Input
Amino acid sequence: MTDRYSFSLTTFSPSGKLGQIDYALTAVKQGVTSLGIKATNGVVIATEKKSSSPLAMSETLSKVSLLTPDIGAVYSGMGPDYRVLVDKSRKVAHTSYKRIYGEYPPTKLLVSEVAKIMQEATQSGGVRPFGVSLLIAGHDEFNGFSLYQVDPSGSYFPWKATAIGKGSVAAKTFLEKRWNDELELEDAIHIALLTLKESVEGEFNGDTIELAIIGDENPDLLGYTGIPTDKGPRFRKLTSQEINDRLEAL
Amino acid sequence: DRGVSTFSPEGRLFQVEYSLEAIKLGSTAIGIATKEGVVLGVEKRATSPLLESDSIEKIVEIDRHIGCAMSGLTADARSMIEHARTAAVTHNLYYDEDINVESLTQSVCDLALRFGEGASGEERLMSRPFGVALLIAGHDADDGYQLFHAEPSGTFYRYNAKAIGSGSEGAQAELLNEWHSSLTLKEAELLVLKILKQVMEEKLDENNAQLSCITKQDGFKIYDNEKTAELIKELKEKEAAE
Amino acid sequence: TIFSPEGRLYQVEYALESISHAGTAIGIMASDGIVLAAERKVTSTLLEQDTSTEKLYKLNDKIAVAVAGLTADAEILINTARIHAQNYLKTYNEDIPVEILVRRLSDIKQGYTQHGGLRPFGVSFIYAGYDDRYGYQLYTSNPSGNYTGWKAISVGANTSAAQTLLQMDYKDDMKVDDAIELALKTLSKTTDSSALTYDRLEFATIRKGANDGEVYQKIFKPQEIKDILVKTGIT
Amino acid sequence: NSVFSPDGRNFQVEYAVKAVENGTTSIGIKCNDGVVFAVEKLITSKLLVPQKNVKIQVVDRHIGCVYSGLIPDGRHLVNRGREEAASFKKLYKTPIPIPAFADRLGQYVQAHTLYNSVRPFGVSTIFGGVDKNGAHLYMLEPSGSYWGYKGAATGKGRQSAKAELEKLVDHHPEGLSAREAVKQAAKIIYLAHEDNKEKDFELEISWCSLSETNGLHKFVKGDLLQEAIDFAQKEIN
Amino acid sequence: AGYDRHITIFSPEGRLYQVEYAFKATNQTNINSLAVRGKDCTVVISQKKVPDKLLDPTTVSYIFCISRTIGMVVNGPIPDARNAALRAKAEAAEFRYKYGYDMPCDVLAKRMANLSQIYTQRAYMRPLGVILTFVSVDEELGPSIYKTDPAGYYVGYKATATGPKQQEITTNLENHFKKSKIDHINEESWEKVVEFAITHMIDALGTEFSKNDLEVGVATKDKFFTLSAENIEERLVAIAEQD
Amino acid sequence: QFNPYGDNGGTILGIAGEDFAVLAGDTRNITDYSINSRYEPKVFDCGDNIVMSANGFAADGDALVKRFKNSVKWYHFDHNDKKLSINSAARNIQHLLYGKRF
Amino acid sequence: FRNNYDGDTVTFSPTGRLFQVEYALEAIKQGSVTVGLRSNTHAVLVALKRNADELSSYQKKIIKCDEHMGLSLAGLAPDARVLSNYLRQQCNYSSLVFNRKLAVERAGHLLCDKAQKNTQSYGGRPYGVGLLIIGYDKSGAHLLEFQPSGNVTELYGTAIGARSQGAKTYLERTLDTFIKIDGNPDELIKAGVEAISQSLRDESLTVDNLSIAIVGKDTPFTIYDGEAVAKYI
Amino acid sequence: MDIILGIRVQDSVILASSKAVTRGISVLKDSDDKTRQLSPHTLMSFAGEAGDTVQFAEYIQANIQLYSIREDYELSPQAVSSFVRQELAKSIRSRRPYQVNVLIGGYDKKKNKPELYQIDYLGTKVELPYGAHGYSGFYTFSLLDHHYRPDMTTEEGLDLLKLCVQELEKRMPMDFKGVIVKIVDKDGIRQVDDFQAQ
Amino acid sequence: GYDRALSIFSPDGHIFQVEYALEAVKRGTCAVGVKGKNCVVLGCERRSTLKLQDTRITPSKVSKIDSHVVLSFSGLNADSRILIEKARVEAQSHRLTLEDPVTVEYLTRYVAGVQQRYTQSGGVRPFGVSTLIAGFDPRDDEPKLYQTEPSGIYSSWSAQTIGRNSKTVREFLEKNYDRKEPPATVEECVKLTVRSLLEVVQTGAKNIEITVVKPDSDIVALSSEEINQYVTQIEQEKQEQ
Output
């Protein structure tokens, strides 16, 4: 039993590369395309639900995840790696913030923490880096809406709009053409749905697309009335029905 | 190249064998046991004439009845000397008597075993064997005057006479011819000095060599330079007439 | 963390190599203040610059750092430096002397050099600070755990070109404003981009603060960079 | 060891198997109300004290274990088997069921196929006994793989032994008796010694039968051992 | 001996060979399984092969009762299968103790998926060479099938198959649901769902089965149980007088 | 509360002559007002021509005697069968007792 | 095939061999010869000691473990110290806790288990020493042979170390004679001394050359060196 | 009950500390110096529990000297007294607290001001024109409230202390065997080794 | 728990990590020590890769350990900070328990002990540092100079040099330093130190720095000009046919 590999599996090569981080990025390249677009009154994150056989139930897989009531995340690369980072992120939002300050963390700080977890997997002994890139969308009272990308190295940066995975090169181009600092949320969704058509090969409907927004407060998703001081989560997943309605007028 | 405590196909421990090679590169140390005491002598081997010769401590006291000369990577001997002093003093604390020379040697040799990459012991707190051999000389009531050679293998051997270090092969042959069970202390002194003169790659004087002994009656003493120089006058004059 | 036959530290040398590909950062120390300037690595139009910080970090109120290397490795070291500064203040009821904070961070790096089997941090820092022992101070630290003080210095990409130019135009009696000008000119000549625009820069000063007798830290806003770029004739 | 080869197999386990096939041959036979165990003891030299280098081992009071391969590895496994039986008894009061005992060794042996810092066991163990609901026989390979058996064999003469066991199974569907299985075991060990006969050998048998031992593990000595040695000698002349 | 072939680090193409090799291991026993959902039950079928005459066949099983309500079938070598089974049993008992209700099928799938993910990331643990199919009638979700693999992947299914001839069985099943236009077997009794499952096993594999060639597990509301040979015989008799 | 000490009563006497010594004790063992035994020796030959008695709480006494006998045995193992002199025994017994100072 | 498989003890070769253990076994074939033999009333150890020089001591090869048990060594001598030390404690524990002398067979089993762990743990090495264990317990006299692989066997007589085969051959033939030497210690030693001589190209075993140990019915384990062995040469 | 007095005048700090060491029914020493120099311009005086007293002082002393040599620089009195406070505040909640009260008298060269800090074993720190620990404060605080002036010379400070000592030798139950007086100013620390029979 | 052995023996009986640490010392800037009749003088050099440095704040190569002992080094600067700290802690610790400051020998034995320890521990590399340690024993006038190296060997020197081109300067000192008649003055002792450094350094500008230790904690660093005074007096005077 017990761990023998007490040394770093990611080391500097003579040219100064960190090989394992590069290969992690290569893994992210093969990943299904995902994108995020920042509007003036919201943020949209979106990806494709690549199904392996029609027997699989696409809805049971969470590609887009709620991290806090105002923060969501999506990814490209290795799904199982994503799933465990979502768990650790949710937990750290509590252990490092809500249990201390009685309020959820601001987007940039939660992002900072995920980044920390991913950096550690770059330097700790006996581990390989995470093979995902994350897009994290959120809102907090003092920064407003924000969107960040997190890479295997633990590096993060804020974007107005971006895309990661397979068709990222082309999609970054598509968004650059379409993004202005005056977009309403509904516009960003429409632009998101346009960008995502270029990616997919087969069916392109509400059952093959996962999309969520960070928008206004949803009081009917709170679960209780009587405390006027919060009107619910800003994170909302769009339904299969709601994506289809925007596809007919696409 | 693979591991620390690995066996060769010939059934020897690689690292233990290579530590022995390190000792062969060391300065010469010679010991002679008699019935009037045990003499220990060393070659200083200063790397430069600016080195203050008597800051070279290759002969150390362990207890009043036990002394020590070293050869090889002499820095490794510091924690062996320290462990030997504690073992001797502790024994006197627990038992109100002197430790036996053999018991002291066995304890130093026990310490020598404690190498290994976190190896299955209890617990190995050392990454490599010592690169130093020790000659441990002393006296105790039961077994009288005694000389021991302690290798970093954890093995120790008793000897009537022994040489360790770079000139040991030639020195040991000369020790085979010259040693007999009736040597006086003064004869032994001359003999150590003589053999040291043969194998020193300088001309032996009181600054590049050091003598010491242990007697029952006076304990372990290091000879100062003036007393040594008189024996070096006495050797050359003894070896003129013959 | 092992030696080569030559007596160099493999992983360190390779980490320094890694740093030499990162956006350039310059430190210029004046008589009445310090300038920090950093170039962002080949960016994009969509990259948000408003809420963006990647090369310039506040350590306490009297000390800032410029980062060349892995952004995430640096966040780790910044956080513990921020904690160390606070430990000092709590213990002594006095702000930490710049040198002490710098030594501590360099000792951390040195550790990864000597034991533990972990890879060194791929980071170099320029530290800009003030204390009442030495006044304004500029320090540098790299992955070897080595630290030195400077009148002017650069780290990351093209340090040879940058250093040559700083030695040409720097003089002991400079003012902060000439130092700001010198820093921007140096980055203009050393960029791999067509020209130097505001969205590719981070900029900070540590001033004696117009009128007060107290030290002020200014991390320049995007508009403030854009403006300071006009006056100097780079528009 | 924590290393799959490209064919999905574990090459370190595969090499442990070779060490087993290189060992002395041992067998288990299930009977109507019990189990019998037998092993082949190579007489290296006349100097070996006869009847004095016992290979079969008891676990608790109702379980026998025999093995082929690296004898020290087998001993390590039985020691663990004993701590596992004790810890089951301490907590649940009842002596450990054989299928339960099988999984305990199973899991433990399997753990030594998970980490590159550990090597797999170089033994196949045949073990079994009588519990609250009948006799059970098991064989456990270096991978941690195990199943229930009617008859089992491992070691240098495993092939010839297996064929003999197969012949018994087919010709006694009604079940064998403890008394008969003992003789049959002696026969089978003589009939596996053909493939290891560059040396003389001593026979060792043990058994656990509800009617013959009250469900406790016991060695076969004296008259009964000689009767089996006689019977095995008889059907080869 | 390139290290990216021996431990779970990335290869230049961003791959994990040890994980790929663990997938290869899952087929070692040359066994196929399939799972289908009925109206108010879930059925698992797996081939049973007992080559050696010396084996006691009642002990040769690849189906496990994890808890009162959850069953699991494993595709892969038995030692790794049993390890996964022991851990899941512990996890399900722990969950119930800490949280006051029975661990749902998908949550245990997720938990086991996560454990596998760790072997994917940590160097000192090899992945387990197994695919695990978890089944139950969940108190919130109804009939449920959740399947995990050595990559740490898991998803829910309308139906599924695993093994050497997985592709044939899957397409066969897809074709049934394409036509029937529903996501389950519209049958009131679990006996008929088993019968369906065996029938499609036969068509896809081009093989007839006797009673000792199969293994059946059925999940109902508040039970997972495995069928006896005689129960299976009765099922085989019923498909004979029809197909 | 549990009291970890008892009193087994019992008296011992040592006298040194020119070239001999005696160590004597009664053989009675008691608890409160009862007799546990009329013959329970408490003076022991420890090897190396040393005799020893530890009188008071007989359980503690027995442990100490055991530990000293065992000490003599290990002395022989560690020090090439040397005879343990009476002064060396004494000192060793100080350490046994003092290790339990609290 | 013999390449990368002798790195550590935690690796099997494709043949099924553990090479580091095979190499540990080899340190024995290089050790000075030692002989064990027993009758029904006594067990005897004879060990030819080996010097480094004509100026050195023949390094001791017989270690006492209890009043009723002891052993002789061939190979790495410090390893014989670790193992005999462990045996001393095991014999001691048996006495203190159970008032019971430790059976030679249990001692054998304990040494086996201890040696086994080192054939399976990473970073450790197998012991590099063979041991001959004699004792007298509640079932009579016993001789055991310990190999660092962890294999222990009980025998009437045996020998280990350099050119041990001669003594082992001689003992296989002398069997029926020596096993009958009951109540006659000196004749059992004699049989052992002549047993060891079948293994000497060397030289004629001298007074400082020879080491003898005996244990038996009313005889605690005792070692003879020099003066006390002179009558056996 | 050990007299520990401190008085901060205009250009210096003066510490007065009792010389007696008493255990049980015996005065063991009549010349004890209850003072450690922490740095050239910082002096600490201490009273309290028999062993804790010197062990704490010397531990503080070692630490400050270490800091000096590491930075080739003297910590300010304010910095020293914060270090001491934190140490005591840690100690109070540990398994066995140091039972020691201190006065810290230093001359801050950067400010050119004398400073007096009073800190008790709990880690309660305060800066004062004059201070005392134990019973002696029950006499001196009111005395100094009356006779003290913020701008006194060092010579006036010494006359003020003479009054304090005299009052303690009149009203305190125990014989404390006079005081050792030390002055901390711009120049450093010196001893007025002639106070007791002046 | 990383304890993988890095310092191990080679077939010819060498510990290559210790050996390569010595190379890093030879890679380091030169340092020199010479002891007189009533003094010991330490001297170092400064490199020329870049010259826009601030010297007010940049760490000098001579460190005070206690008020009466100083340490100078060649090799990895970052490694030397660790030895310097540990040496400073020991010095204070010795003061606390022995009520006396360290002898120079004792402080040397401690530092050498630390370097030795790092030659035989799992998962650590030896110090790429070799030191000169100089000062005076408390209440003593006899001057003291000691050298340590990556292996943990230490010894005392009438005079000694370490670092790059030390081969050359040890050449000079061996010819010039007379055991009979140490340099009797502080002045003539600083003279021999500057001369020996001139063989390697080039222009004694912003490169040569000098520190003097006298009995009873009397340690003064020299100034650029007070250095230039020796530079001028030797270059012109000792240039004659």
Observations:
- Chain G touches chain F through four residues (CB under 8 Å).
